[PDB]
Amino acid sequence: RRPQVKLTAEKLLSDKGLPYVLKNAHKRIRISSKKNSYDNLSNIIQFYQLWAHELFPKAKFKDFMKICQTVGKTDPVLREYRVSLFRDEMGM
Amino acid sequence: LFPPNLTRRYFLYFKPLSQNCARRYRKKAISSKPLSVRQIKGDFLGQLITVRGIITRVSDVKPAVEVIAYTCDQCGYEVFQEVNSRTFTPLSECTSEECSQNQTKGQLFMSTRASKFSAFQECKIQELSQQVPVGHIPRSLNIHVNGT
DNA sequence: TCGTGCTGAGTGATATCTGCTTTGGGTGGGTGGGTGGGTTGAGGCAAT
DNA sequence: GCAGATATCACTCAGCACGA
Ligand SMILES: [Zn+2]
Incomplete structure (x- = not known):
């Protein structure tokens, strides 16, 4: 009767998602030599889990990562953009 | 957004129509006219009426x-x-x-x-000895009290 | 070296279904009602 | 009319083999 919510390229490419990550990802995340490795890993996973929950509350963190892997493998439009970001850096 | 009753923090009550006011302005007061538990029949359901009697049971305040x-x-x-x-x-x-x-x-x-939540009390009111007909036993009417 | 159409498999939501009493007992009541029913006997203690 | 326990059917997804 109702199509299942699914992590499509459209949601990822929306303002919330990859654009949000590129906007503010280095400022919030911070790996410090003084702090232990566990704390830095916790901080990184803390940022990414919050972003995923804001974007895709449906799936847990590990499931979100696996779905992201599959989508990146499949979707061509996602590949287009992923190549594009790298291309801009080569330009820079 | 939220239901209107949630934000309300006041209770609205009705004061019956006093006999003096009714006679002053040429009207009959049905609400203020005291009655007895015997006279409260099904025809009065859904109206504002007055009952005269003696309280015979009260309950502890509970949150409804x-x-x-x-x-x-x-x-x-x-x-x-x-x-x-x-x-x-x-x-x-x-x-x-x-x-x-x-x-x-x-x-x-x-x-x-x-x-x-609103404070809730359940009480009982009974007829006085001056209202029971000969050969009949007194009756009781439940009362619900809410608010202040 | 690899991309995609076909398949079995397994949940999700939804269809029918049974059930909607239940129960002996006074801290479940009598505005829930008797076509839902409840039928002791000895022993201890206050009053005198 | 209402809540709960139960079983039914339909739809969609990850693997597989082949052909490009
Ligand atoms: Zn919610």
Whole structure:
């Protein structure tokens, strides 16, 4: 009767998602030599889990990562953009 | 957004029409006219009436819930349910637009810190010895008291 | 070296279904009602 | 009319082999 919510390229490419990550990802995340490795890993996973929950509350963190892997493998439009970001850096 | 009754913090009560006012302006007062538990029949249901009698039982003040507040552990959204009967069925799944667009099966959990309560008392009123007809026993009428 | 159409498999939501009493007992009542029923006997203690 | 326990059917997804 109702199509299942699914992590499509459209949601990822929306303002919330990859654009949000590129906007503010280095400022919030911070790996410090003084702090232990566990704390830095916790901080990184803390940022990414919050972003995923804001974007895709449906799936847990590990499931979100696996779905992201599959989508990146499949979707061509996602590949287009992923190549594009790298291309801009080569330009820079 | 939220039900209107939730924000209300006042209680509205009606004062009957005194006999002096009714006679002053050429009218008959039905509400103020005292009655007895015997005369309160089914025809008076849904009206404002006065009853004269002696209280024979009172209960301890208890909180009667009027608006229940729930919290979704996923959305962060609160769901308010009005209760206007002697019994109600608690909500289980979130109905927020967030749980709808994402179709997440978030669970609602009751939170008594945000609900609305009103003091409740149940009493009994009985007829005086001057109102019981010969050969009849006194009757009792339940009274519900809410608010202040 | 690899991309995609076909398939079995397994949940999700939804269809029918049974059930909607239940129960012996006074901190479940009598505005829930008797076509839902409850039928002791000895022993201890206050009053005198 | 109402809540709960139960079983039914339909739809969609990850693997597989082949052909490009
Ligand atoms: Zn919710």
